[PDB]
Amino acid sequence: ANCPGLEVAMGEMEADVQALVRRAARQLAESGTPSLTAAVLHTIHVLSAYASIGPLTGVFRETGALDLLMHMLEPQIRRSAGKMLQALAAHDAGSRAHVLLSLSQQMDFDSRYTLLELFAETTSSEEHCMAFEGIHLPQIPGKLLFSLVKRYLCVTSLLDQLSRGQRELEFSMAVGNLISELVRSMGWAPPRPTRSIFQPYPLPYLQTQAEWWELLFFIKKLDLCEQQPIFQNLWGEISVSVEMAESLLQVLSSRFTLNDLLNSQIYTKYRPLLKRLQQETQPFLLLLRTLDAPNKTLLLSVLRVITRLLDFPEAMVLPWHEVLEPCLNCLSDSEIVQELTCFLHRLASMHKDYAVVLCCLGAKEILSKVGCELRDLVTECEKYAQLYSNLTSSILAGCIQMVLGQIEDHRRTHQNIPFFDVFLRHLCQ
C-alpha cells in the first residue's frame, strides 16, 4: 500500500568463501611471511566488499566467517578486520554483537581499551549515531562503561530472533538489566481524572503481570544455588496473592545491591561497619550529602579520612564517581588548594579511571590556571576523552532507540517489561 517500489551468484559466493577461507588458514599456518599476510589481507578486503551485499549475509553467517574474524583479531590484520567488522555490521547487527561479545568472552586497561575501541569503531550504525543538544551528560568510569556496553550487546544479541514464552521472558529480563545498569551508571535515581486524549453517546474507548515479572527478576538476581530451594518452593506466570508476595519479599530480604530493591515500587506497594556503610547505599548517598559542604574543620578532617581510606587495600565499592566532579568544579584557602592537591594525588594513585575522567573533564586545562604530577597524569594522553564521551553518547542513543522500537511493536501487536515505567517517566520529566 505505502511503498510499492520494492542463486548462481550465491553459489559462486560460497565457493569464494571456501577459497578465501582456506587461503586465510594457509596465511595463519604461514604466519611468518608478511607477504602472504598482506595478500590474504587485501583478499579479506575484497571479501568485506562482497559481504557488503545485502542478501549475502545469509551465506556469510552460514559459512561462519566469524571464526576467521576472531582468529584474525598484526596491525594490518587488526585494522583490516576492524574495517571488516564495520562493513559486516552496518547491515546486520546480530552476529556483530555476537562475535564481539564472544571475543570478549575469550581486565587490564589495555584489554578494556582494545575492546571499547573495537566497539566504538566497528558498531556505529544509524541507530547508535544521532544528535544531542549538549545537555549535561555526565562522565562515568571505565569499568562501569564496559559493563553497560556488554549489557547493550547482549540485548541486541537476542533482540531479533524473537517456547516463545521463554524468548519473551529472556528478552524482558535483558532489557530490564540494561535499563537498570544505565539508570545506575548515569546516575538518575493523585493522578488526574480520566480525560480523553482526543476530545479537545458513551465513548467505547474511554471506559498484575508486570508486578510478578519484576518480582521474578529480583528473584533471579539471587544465587542460582540458594534459589534452587526457592525454585522448589515456587514449584513462570503464576499469579500471586499479596500475602504470598509479602512472604517473598521478606524471605528475599534475608539473602542480601538492594538499595534499588528498597527504592522500588514493588516494596512500596508490598570493616564490617565499613561493610555496612557500603552495602547500605543509603549511607552512600549520605556520604554524598555530607560531602555536599565555611565547613573548614569538618571538611578538612573528612578529606583526611577519605584519603587514609583512599589507600585502603579493598572496598573500592565506594562510588568513586561523584568523588571528583564536585571538588573539580569547586576549585580560596591555601589549605583548600593543598587539600585539592592531596585529593587529586590520591585519586590518580591507585586506578587511572577517575583521573582519566578528570582529563575528559578539563584537568590539564585547570593545571594551567595554577601542581606538577597533577598535569603529568592529566595530560598523560588525551587520546581517550573523545572516545569515552563517544561511548557514552552512543550507548544512550541505542537505548532510546530500543525504547521507541518496543513502543512501535506493541502498537502493532495490541498488548510491559521491568523498569520501563522508570525509564519512560524519567525521560518524560
Curated annotation (Swiss-Prot):
Disulfide pairings: none
Q: How is it modified after translation?
A: Neddylated. Neddylation is mediated by E1 enzyme UBA3-NAE1 complex and E2 enzyme UBE2F. Structural rearrangment of the C-terminal TRIAD/RBR supradomain may play a role in neddylation and deneddylation.
**Compartment list:** Cytoplasm
> In which tissues does this protein get expressed?
Ubiquitously expressed in all tissues with highest expression in testis brain and kidney.
What does this protein do, in the record's words? Core component of a Cul9-RING ubiquitin-protein ligase complex composed of CUL9 and RBX1. The CUL9-RBX1 complex mediates ubiquitination and subsequent degradation of BIRC5 and is required to maintain microtubule dynamics and genome integrity. Acts downstream of the 3M complex, which inhibits the ubiquitination of BIRC5. The CUL9-RBX1 complex also mediates mono-ubiquitination of p53/TP53. Acts as a cytoplasmic anchor protein in p53/TP53-associated protein complex. Regulates the subcellular localization of p53/TP53 and its subsequent function.
Per the record, the domain comment is:
The C-terminal TRIAD/RBR supradomain is essential for ubiquitination activity. The IBR domain is required for interaction with UBCH7 and UBCH8.
Concerning its family, UniProt says: Belongs to the cullin family.
Q: How does it assemble?
A: Component of the Cul9-RING complex consisting of CUL9 and RBX1; the CUL9-RBX1 complex is a heterododecamer composed of six CUL9 and six RBX1 protomers. Interacts (via C-terminal TRIAD/RBR supradomain) with E2 ubiquitin-conjugating enzyme UBE2L3. Interacts with CUL7; the interaction with the CUL7 component of the 3M complex leads to inhibition of CUL9 activity. The CUL7-CUL9 heterodimer seems to interact specifically with TP53, likely via the CPH domain. Forms a complex with p53/TP53 in the cytoplasm of unstressed cells. Interacts with UBCH7 and UBCH8.
Descriptive protein name: Cullin-9
The top of its lineage is: Eukaryota, Metazoa, Chordata, Craniata, Vertebrata
